[PDB]
C-alpha cells in the first residue's frame, strides 16, 4: 500500500512559526513530486504549494507566498512545509498529497494524507471537560440513547470513540461549535435496551494538546 | 477562475445526477475528487462514475446514484494546471421523510459541582435539514443560552441529525424546575416534545 502521514501540527499564535511533516511510504519518494492543500472550517480546498520530483521547481498560491517555504527529504522520505507569519486565515485542516497519474491523461493527486490540524490563535490552549449524559428515567424502549457532552476545550480536534471503538453504528458525533475561545462538542450513542444499564458503556475522550486520555463512563442517576 | 454549476445539488438514488466545471482557459483534461463526512478527498476521476467534457466545459456523471455518493465534491485542472481546486458542490440525496427521534438529558452531578449545568436534546435521523427547535422552561420559551451543531448527510442513512445544549449555572437552574425540549419538523404538524422536570431527582 501506499501511505501519507501529516505531522507537527497543532496551536499557533498570529505572527509565529510552524513546521510540518508529511512522513511517505510504499513509492520511490524521490521519483514523485508532492503537493500540500489545506482545507478551511468553511470546507474550501486551496492548493497551496508544490515541489517537483526533486526539488527541482516550486510553485505557491497567492495566500501564501514568501511566508511558506516548501521543501523535501528524498533520503529519509520526507516532505516539509514552513510557515512563517501565521494568520487567522491560515487555520485549516493541512493535507499532503503525491501528484502522479502518467499515461492517458496526465499527472493527478492520486493518494492523499490523514490531514493534521493547524490553528491560529493567541488564545489559551484548554483541555475538555468529559460530562456522561444519562437520561432521566430507565423507562422501556426499543432501544435507549445515551450520550457524552465534551464540555469548555481548545483547540480542536478531539477524537470521541465508544467502548474502545467497538461501538460505532447508531453513532452521531456532532461538530463542535465555537464560543468565547472554548469549543463544545457532545457524541451521541443508541443503544438496544436490553444492554443498558445491565451492560456497561464508555465514551473515550483524546484531546491531543492537553495530552489528556479521558474515558468516562455512563452510569443512571438511580 | 474555474467553476461549478450547483453550489448545491439533490437527487434521489437510482436517479442520473450531473455537475459541470467551468475554467476560464482552455484545457486537455480534467480532475474531480470526492470528500466524504470525516474523511480526506479521494481520487476519482464503480461503474457509475464517468467523465464527459469538450474544450473547456467539463462534466461529471453519476448514473444510478447511491446513498454512499451523498459527498462534496471538487474539480480541478487538466494541461494547464497551477494547481488550483474549484468551487466545490454539495451533493446532497433526496429521501422519505423521517421523524426526528427526540432525546433530552439532566446536566451530570460532575457538571453540576463545577458551577455549570448543560441540558442537551438529541434529535437524531432525520428528512429534511430543516428543524425548529424552543427550548422551554416552565412553559416559557427561551431563545438565547443555546447552542446547536447539526450533521451533514450520513453516508449509509442518508438522514441530518443535531445536539441543542442549552447552558445555564447551577444557581439559574434551581428557580426553574421543569425544563422541556420541542422540536418542529415537516413530518408531523404537532411538534415532537421530551421533557424532564427536576426537584424530582432520580
Redesign the interface.
Known amino acids: 500500500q501506499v501511505q501519507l502521514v501529516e505531522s507537527g501540527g497543532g496551536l499557533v499564535k498570529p505572527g509565529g512559526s510552524k513546521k510540518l511533516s508529511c512522513a511517505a511510504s510504499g513509492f520511490t519518494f524521490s521519483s514523485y513530486a508532492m503537493?500540500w492543500?489545506r482545507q478551511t472550517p468553511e470546507?474550501?480546498?486551496?492548493?497551496v504549494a508544490?515541489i517537483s520530483t526533486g526539488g527541482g521547481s516550486t510553485?505557491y498560491?497567492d495566500s501564501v507566498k514568501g511566508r511558506f517555504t516548501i521543501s523535501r527529504d528524498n533520503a529519509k522520505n520526507t516532505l516539509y512545509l514552513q510557515m512563517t507569519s501565521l494568520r487567522s486565515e491560515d487555520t485549516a485542516m493541512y493535507?499532503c498529497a503525491r501528484?502522479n497519474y502518467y499515461g492517458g491523461?496526465?499527472?493527478?493527486?492520486?493518494?492523499?494524507?490523514?490531514?493534521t490540524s493547524v490553528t491560529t490563535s493567541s488564545a489559551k490552549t484548554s483541555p475538555p471537560?468529559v460530562?456522561?449524559?444519562?437520561?432521566?428515567?430507565g423507562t422501556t424502549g426499543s432501544s435507549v440513547?445515551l450520550?457524552c457532552?465534551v464540555?469548555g476545550y481548545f483547540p480542536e480536534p478531539v477524537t470521541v470513540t465508544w467502548n474502545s471503538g467497538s461501538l460505532s453504528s447508531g453513532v452521531?458525533t456532532?461538530?463542535?461549535?465555537l464560543?468565547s475561545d472554548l469549543y463544545?462538542?457532545?457524541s451521541?450513542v443508541?443503544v438496544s435496551s436490553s444492554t443498558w444499564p445491565s451492560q456497561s458503556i464508555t465514551c473515550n475522550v483524546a484531546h491531543p494538546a492537553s495530552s489528556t486520555k479521558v474515558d468516562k463512563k455512563i452510569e443512571?442517576?438511580? | 477562475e474555474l467553476t461549478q454549476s450547483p453550489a448545491i445539488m439533490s437527487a434521489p438514488p437510482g436517479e442520473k445526477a450531473t455537475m459541470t466545471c467551468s475554467a476560464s482557459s482552455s484545457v486537455s483534461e480534467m480532475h474531480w475528487y470526492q470528500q466524504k463526512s470525516g474523511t480526506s478527498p479521494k481520487g476519482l476521476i464503480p461503474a457509475r462514475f464517468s467523465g464527459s467534457g469538450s474544450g473547456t466545459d467539463y462534466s461529471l456523471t453519476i448514473s444510478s446514484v447511491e446513498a454512499e455518493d451523498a459527498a462534496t465534491y471538487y474539480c480541478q485542472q487538466g494541461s494547464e494546471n497551477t494547481e488550483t481546486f474549484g468551487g466545490g458542490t454539495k451533493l446532497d440525496i433526496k429521501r422519505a421523510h423521517a421523524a426526528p427521534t427526540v432525546s433530552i438529558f439532566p446536566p451530570s452531578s460532575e457538571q453540576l459541582t463545577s458551577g455549570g449545568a448543560s441540558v442537551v436534546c438529541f434529535l437524531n435521523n432525520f428528512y429534511p435539514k430543516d428543524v425548529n427547535v424552543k427550548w422551554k422552561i416552565d412553559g416559557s420559551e427561551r431563545q438565547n443560552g443555546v447552542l446547536n451543531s447539526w450533521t451533514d448527510q450520513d453516508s449509509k442513512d442518508s438522514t441530518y441529525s443535531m445536539s441543542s445544549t442549552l447552558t445555564l449555572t447551577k444557581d439559574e437552574y434551581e428557580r426553574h424546575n421543569s425544563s422541556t425540549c420541542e422540536a418542529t419538523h415537516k413530518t408531523s404538524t404537532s411538534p415532537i416534545v421530551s421533557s424532564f422536570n427536576a426537584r424530582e431527582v432520580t
Open positions: 503537493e492543500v470546507k474550501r480546498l486551496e492548493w508544490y510553485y498560491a493535507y501528484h491523461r496526465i499527472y493527478s493527486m492520486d493518494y492523499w494524507g490523514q490531514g471537560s460530562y456522561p449524559l444519562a437520561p432521566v428515567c440513547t450520550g457532552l464540555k452521531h456532532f461538530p463542535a461549535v464560543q463544545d462538542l457532545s451521541s443508541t443512571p442517576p438511580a
